[PDB]
Amino acid sequence: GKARAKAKTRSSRAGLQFPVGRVHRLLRKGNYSERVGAGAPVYLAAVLEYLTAEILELAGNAARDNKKTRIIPRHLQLAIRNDEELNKLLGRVTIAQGGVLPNIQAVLL
Amino acid sequence: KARAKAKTRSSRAGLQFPVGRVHRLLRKGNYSERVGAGAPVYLAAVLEYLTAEILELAGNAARDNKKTRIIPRHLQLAIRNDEELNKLLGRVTIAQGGVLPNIQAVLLP
Amino acid sequence: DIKALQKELEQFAKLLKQKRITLGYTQADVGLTLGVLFGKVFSQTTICRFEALQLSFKNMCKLRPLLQKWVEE
Amino acid sequence: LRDNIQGITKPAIRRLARRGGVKRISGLIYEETRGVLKVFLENVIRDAVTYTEHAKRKTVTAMDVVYALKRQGRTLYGFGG
Amino acid sequence: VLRDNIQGITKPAIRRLARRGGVKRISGLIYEETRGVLKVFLENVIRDAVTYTEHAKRKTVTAMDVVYALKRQGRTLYGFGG
Amino acid sequence: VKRPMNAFMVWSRGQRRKMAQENPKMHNSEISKRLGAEWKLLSETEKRPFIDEAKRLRALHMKEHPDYKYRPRR
Amino acid sequence: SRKESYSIYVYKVLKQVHPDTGISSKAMGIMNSFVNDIFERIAGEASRLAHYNKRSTITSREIQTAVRLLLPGELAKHAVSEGTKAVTKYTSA
Amino acid sequence: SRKESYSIYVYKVLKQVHPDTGISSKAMGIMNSFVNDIFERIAGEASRLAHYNKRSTITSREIQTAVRLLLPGELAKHAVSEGTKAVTKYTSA
Amino acid sequence: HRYRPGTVALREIRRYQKSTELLIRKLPFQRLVREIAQDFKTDLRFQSSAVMALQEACEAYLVGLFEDTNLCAIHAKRVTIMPKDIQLARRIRGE
Amino acid sequence: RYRPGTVALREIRRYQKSTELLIRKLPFQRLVREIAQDFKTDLRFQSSAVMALQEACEAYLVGLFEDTNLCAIHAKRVTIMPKDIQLARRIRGE
DNA sequence: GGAGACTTTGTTATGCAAATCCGCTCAATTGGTCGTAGACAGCTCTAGCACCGCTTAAACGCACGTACGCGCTGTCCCCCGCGTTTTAACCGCCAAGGGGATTACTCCCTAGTCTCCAGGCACGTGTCAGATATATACATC
DNA sequence: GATGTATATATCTGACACGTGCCTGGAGACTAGGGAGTAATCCCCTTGGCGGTTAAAACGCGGGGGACAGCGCGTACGTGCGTTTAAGCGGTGCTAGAGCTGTCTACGACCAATTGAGCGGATTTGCATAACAAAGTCTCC
């Protein structure tokens, strides 16, 4: 894995930015199972972090294309719809104030 | 209903479906930490109602086709020719169900 | 004395402005220069509000030593 | 209240249609579109009201709307949830 | 090793399905398009059925793995367990 | 009291005057688009004399009007 | 190896609605998938309602709300009426 | 009165990905809904797998299987690699 | 001076595709929501956020419907959308 | 000889009334195995797993043909073409 | 006869919302004990694979003719775009008060344990409703 | 008149409906401990109204572009017919692997004490925008 971690929290040991202890609590709470294994919140926090990073990266690139330094709902919508895997994962999601993509059928020109 | 005289819970409730089993299935399965006393009674009554409704319609289909027995096809006809059940079961595939005899008018001579 | 402080800050900001203009520098340059000298980079919005004294007394006092250095350099 | 369905005016219908890429709209679209909108709203509102009532509240909140939409396969992001 | 069994879905298999669906006439290119569609549907259902099978550490795909694979896609199937 | 010219402005009225003389009766929106593009394509060395003139003009402007405050309004 | 199903109960209902009609084993396999599917959906929604309102108990009220959200048209009304009677009678018996 | 969210962690990730880009509050509201929705789907499927295989415990294996079932293509593959690595580092000395 | 028909329609299509604001005016939308709600139960109140959530969802729905409606019209070799293109899109879709 | 369309209408009624599988069983199994082999080698199938896959596949294709037929009618045709299949899939969201 | 629109870049000021800081709370981290869920080894014996040979129903190829798809023309409806009139949305501000959230008590309902025993299930009998085959007549093309 | 489908008989078969005896999950009665319900308090956000500005909606008109109906070719599909293929059935056999049980240990729940990461509420600070320098040309009040 990554070379090291010494700090006390679980997120630090796992090399993550996302919380681990919180994830564990949320898994214990709403009746998903009677028991939650030690690696369950670690593995899951890493996955959520990965997916979070991809959307933000793509949205940030959209912001630069519009010559802005900020992510707004529109940039998130473009980031998702111009990426096939995210588009499938989030295919049914309505993003408030996200707008639409500029698709004009050629037959109308 | 006027009365019951038995030791079982299904009898007290005037039901044919088991009550104790429903309670057991609600406790197991992680639906909640607790299951209230009326929860399996109310639920058993609902399952019984819906079961009775399908069978009555399927039985009528069997007689229309001049049969004494219900087969998967009659269950399909009973459901598809009834709007409320069709919505409830709109995505259900019935093994050996068959289809309704729908022919578009534009195809006819 | 808040009035004595106000006068000192007004005088400082005025000297800062006069040197900035005399030497041909923009508010953007004061901002960038401070970043290089201190690690704390300021935008021209901050420099404008400082010169206009639209900032709190504490911010002006805290930023002043950095701006004093800017004038000297 | 009565007849507020007419508050969805022709230009509203057209602007939505344009966003969707429609170049020409026949004259009967306006009524058909209103019928569609109304059905969508009744189904979403009815469920939001049902959640509101279950909880014994009198005010429909954003979350009741969000759950009503989630159940229809229309997950909405940005209003809580 | 198996190959080219997509052709096992013969023209009459396609025609019969189309007729059950009420189709009166079929273009000559339907046959190929239909095969492409069937194959995609099967790959997605099989892939999930295999995934459930591996999780459970079995080597045999059972009816239940197929049923969960289908349930998951919004296609509940009745009569093989559920 | 009017504002001092910046480096673009010192350069552009010099070049705008040239453009107007070479091509009189040319609309300034054409001249301005061309001047904008040329400025963007200039090196720091090429811009430098206008930068230095702009610096001098700003200092002179302040000395001429030490009490000038730019007050734009909506 | 022991399994549970509702074939007894389905059969008993059939004889009340149609005393002279039988049911094939494949038809019975379908009725069992049906009962299990409805059970899960109602129980699933009732679970969610309890969670949403920060409760840990499923009562007859959640089951009733879940029925209204899941069943269309008049199925919801008749199912609610029947559930109400079963609880009422049970309580008093 | 206290309500939790992932706003702080989302910000921290944005910093590493794009050091000079900020995020609006509305965009953050969307990112919080995104994380909550993915969390529930994965946790939901992992729960179902444990039930199907008659286990009472959710472990990293169910989470991994749930990830493969829910995420498409290469998105799933890279997510699996990151999860595997984090667990390995976590349990390692 | 005049533009030929369709010139403006294309400008509008680009304009509306680029922007993100709501297209249905808010007060009449809000009254429609209340009218419907009264039939289900009287004396309900709504949070302003509930109304906004409904509106956002409604427009997203109608916009998606128009995209599919438009495809149906193209399939039929038309530019103009008609009620039947809406109905076909809904039926195939499953509504 | 019968005129074109007499037989097709006959067959439509016949297939709508019956319930049997239309795709031959052994060809279907080989297709299932071929696909499964690409995902993982040495898998076995229960006979009931294959039947579940086959019932689902036919139900899927039949439903697709019904929507395909509507599209062809909309376009004022009787004959179904690849584009009607594609339109139906696109509207559905595949 | 005079103002202002129109265009370019770069420096200044300005409204609002986002990034950063402080102090305090309370959810996350140690560290230890307990009990049981699940890993592992070993056994039975189900049911899934593989091959062979025969019948025979369905698939395959090819010839023929015509019903349908496609392109073209021409007519008339009806939707677009413009400019003018009218209407109701939107903006601020204000007051009134109903319902949502919080807190602190109280009593009832459900989990858990233990006991008892009859309703439900594999397994073996016993009877028949509709398929399979023949022969008659009418429905549809 | 020719080609298909439903209806009047006789027989038997796989499939169902019934009855024993054996558990093993369902029901009854106690107890304890938390959860949900009640009443009383605060005060935040909702409704409702008011007047004024003006941006969007409504209306009419005329003109062009597109929907629509009708026609005529030509080829791509259906429908028969005879030959060929491979499915389906039954039979024999083997053995991998599902499914079960029984020990035993590492794993996670639970508790109680401790402590730093994260929360809200202030407070700093940047983005995003827009006004204006010069200058000449053209437009409108």
> Distances from the Cα of B24 to the Cαs of A11, B27, B34, D77, G15, in angstroms?
39, 5, 11, 37, 27
Instruction: List the chains bordering chain D where 3 or more Cβ pairs fall under 8 Å.
Output: A, G, H, I
Distance (Å) of CA J14 to CA E49, G28, J2: 34, 26, 17
Burial class for B100, CB neighbours closer than 10 Å (0-12, 13-18, 19+): exposed
Specify the 3-state DSSP secondary structure of A53.
helix
Return the closest-CA partner of residue G80 out of G59, G60, G51, G50: G60
Instruction: Find the angle CA(D57)-CA(D62)-CA(D66) to the nearest 5 degrees.
Output: 110
Which residues in window 64-83 of A are less than 7 A from strand L by Cβ?
68-70
Contact D48, D60 (CB under 8 A): yes
For residue A70, the SS3 value is: strand
Residue pair I14/A102 in contact (Cβ under 8 Å)? The answer is yes
User: Residues B101, B81: contact at Cβ < 8 Å?
Assistant: no
**Tokens encoding A50:** 């990965």
For D45, residues 6+ apart whose C-beta sits below 8 A from its C-beta are: D68, I33, I36, I37, I40, I54
Q: What is the C-alpha to C-alpha distance for residues A51 and H9, in angstroms, rounded to an integer?
A: 13
Contact criterion met (CB below 8 Å) for A62 and A78: yes
Write the single-letter amino acid at G24.
S
Q: Which domain holds residue A39?
A: 1-109
Residue I72, C-beta contacts closer than 8 angstroms, at least 6 positions apart = I81, I85, I88, I89, J71, J74, J87, J91
G54: left (phi over 0), alpha (psi -120 to 50) or beta: left
CATH of the domain at C49: 1.10.260.40
Distance from CA of H31 to the nearest CA of D (A): 8
* Residues in chain H closer than 8 A to E57 (CB atoms): none
Q: Cα(G18)–Cα(J9) distance, rounded to whole angstroms?
A: 36
Whether nucleic acid strand K comes within 7 Å of the CB of I94, the answer is: no
Q: What is the DSSP letter of D77?
A: E
Residue at token pair 């003009």: F57
DSSP structure string for B52-104: HHHHHHHHHHHHHTT-SEE-HHHHHHHHHTSHHHHHHTTT-EETT--------
Domain count, chain C: 1
CA-nearest residue of chain B to G23?
Answer: B70
Q: Say if the Cβ atoms of D77 and H30 lie within 8 Å.
A: yes
The tokens for F73 are 């309004």
Cα→Cα distances C2→C8, C14, C47, C57, C64, Å: 10, 18, 22, 9, 16
> How many residues are given for chain D?
81
- E51 and H65 within 8 Å at the Cβ level: the answer is yes
Q: How far is the CA of E22 from the CAs of E14, I91, J72, in angstroms?
A: 13, 16, 12
- C6 annotated as a binding-site residue: no
Tokens representing I45?
């109140």
Residue D40: which domain range? 1-81
What are the boundaries of each domain within chain F? Answer: 1-74
Burial class (CB in 10 A: 0-12, 13-18, 19+), B24: middle
Specify the resolution in Å.
3.0
Chain H residues inside the 8 Å CB shell of D81 = 33, 36-37
Question: Is the distance from CB of A1 to CB of H86 less than 8 angstroms?
Answer: yes
Q: Distance between CA atoms of F47 and G15, rounded to whole angstroms?
A: 99
Instruction: Identify which of B87, B42, E77, B95 has the alpha carbon closest to the alpha carbon of residue G36.
Output: E77
Q: Which structure tokens are listed for F10?
A: 């010192």
Q: Are J68 and J84 in contact (CB under 8 A)?
A: yes
Q: Among residues E71, E69, J43, A18, which one has the least CA distance to residue H68?
A: E69
Alpha helices in chain I (DSSP H): 7-18, 26-40, 48-75, 83-93
I80 and chain A: CB distance < 8 Å anywhere? no
Question: Cα(A33)–Cα(B29) distance, rounded to whole angstroms?
Answer: 9
Phi, psi at residue B29, to the nearest 5°? 105, -5
- Burial call D18-50: b when 16+ CB within 10 Å, e when fewer: bbbbbbbbeeebbebbbebbbebbeebbbbbbb
- Separation in Å, CA I28 to CA C10, D28, E5, E39, H50: 55, 21, 60, 49, 50
For residue I36, give its domain range.
1-95
In chain F, whose CA is at the least distance from the CA of C14? F66
Residues whose CB is less than 8 angstroms from the CB of residue I58 and which lie 6 or more positions away in sequence, other chains included: D37, D40, D41, I24, I29
In this structure, which amino acid lies at residue B102? N
SS3 B18: coil
DSSP G9: H
- Strand L: list positions under 7 Å from protein Cβ: 4-5, 15-17, 25-28, 35-36, 45-47, 56-58, 63-68, 76-80, 86-88, 96-100, 107-109, 117-120, 123-128, 130-138
State the burial class of residue F64 (Cβ atoms within 10 Å of its Cβ: 0-12, 13-18, 19+). exposed
Task: Supply the CATH number for residue E43's domain.
Answer: 1.10.20.10
Number of domains comprising chain D: 1
The CA distance from I78 to H55, in Å, is 58
Write the DSSP assignment of D17-60 as a string of letters: HHHTT--EE-TTHHHHHHHHHHHHHHHHHHHHHHHHHHTT-SEE
Q: Measured between CB atoms, does E73 come within 8 Å of chain G?
A: no
- Which architecture, in CATH terms, is F1-74? Orthogonal Bundle (1.10)
Q: How far apart are CA H44 and CA H38, in angstroms?
A: 10
> What is the C-alpha to C-alpha distance for residues B46 and G78, in angstroms, rounded to an integer?
9
Pairwise CA distance, residues B73 & A42, whole Å? 50
Q: In Å, what is the CA distance from J35 to each residue of H89, J25, J94?
A: 36, 16, 20
Taking CA–CA distances from G45, the nearest residue in chain D reads D71
How was this structure determined? It was done by cryo-EM
HSE (CB half, 13 Å, CA atoms) of B76?
23
Contacting residues for I95 by C-beta, under 8 A, at least 6 apart: none
Q: Which nucleotide is nearest to A9 (CA to C1')?
A: K29
Query: In chain E, what is the greatest distance between 2 CA atoms, to the nearest angstrom?
Result: 47
Q: Tell how far CA C12 is from the center of its chain.
A: 8
Measured CA C60 to C1' K136 distance, in angstroms: 114
DSSP state of I94: T
- Specify the nucleotide whose C1' lies closest to residue A8 (CA): K29
CB H35 within 8 A of CB H10: yes
How far apart, in whole angstroms, are the C-alpha atoms of residue J22 and residue E21?
A: 12
Q: What is the CATH number of the domain that holds B5?
A: 1.10.20.10
Residues 6 or more apart from B41 whose CB is under 8 A from it? Answer: B9, B13, B15, B19, G60, G83, G86, G87, G90
Could you give the CA distance from residue A108 to residue D58 in angstroms, rounded to a whole number?
49
The domain locations on chain G are: 1-93
Q: Which residues contact I92 (CB under 8 A, 6 or more apart)?
A: J67, J70, J71, J88, J91, J92
Structure tokens that stand for A10 in this block: 């679980």
Per the CB < 8 A criterion, the answer to whether D54 and G53 are in contact is yes
Query: Please, what is the end-to-end C-alpha distance for chain D in angstroms?
Result: 31
B104 touches strand K (CB under 7 A): no
Whether C69 contacts C37, CB under 8 Å: yes
Note down the domain range covering C10: 1-73
Nearest to I71 by CA among J92, B73, G62: J92
Helix (H) or strand (E) holding B35: strand B34-35
Q: Give chain A's length.
A: 109
Q: Domain tally for chain I?
A: 1
Task: Quote the CA–CA distance of D73 and D47 in Å, as a whole number.
Answer: 13
**What distance in Å separates the CA atoms of residue I37 and residue I56, rounded to the nearest whole number?**
17
Which two tokens mark J92? 């559905």
Q: How far is CA G8 from CA A56, B18, D6, G15, in A?
A: 56, 10, 56, 11
For helices H60-70 and H73-91, the axis angle rounded to 10 degrees is 170
| Cβ pair D65, I50 in contact under 8 A | yes
Alpha-helical segments (H) within E1-82: 11-20, 30-55, 63-71
Question: How many Å does it take to go from CA G45 to C1' L110?
Answer: 31
The fold of the H1-93 domain, in CATH, is Histone, subunit A (1.10.20)
Q: Which residues are bridge partners to B58 per DSSP?
A: none
- The letter for the amino acid at B8 is T
CA gap D78, D62 in Å, rounded: 10
Tell me the H-state helices in chain G.
Answer: 7-17, 25-52, 60-70, 73-92
Which residue has 């921290």 as its token pair?
H12
CA angle B41, B8, B13 (to 5 degrees): 35
Q: Which residues, including other chains, have CB under 8 Å from residue A13's CB and lie 6 or more apart?
A: A5, A7, H89, H90
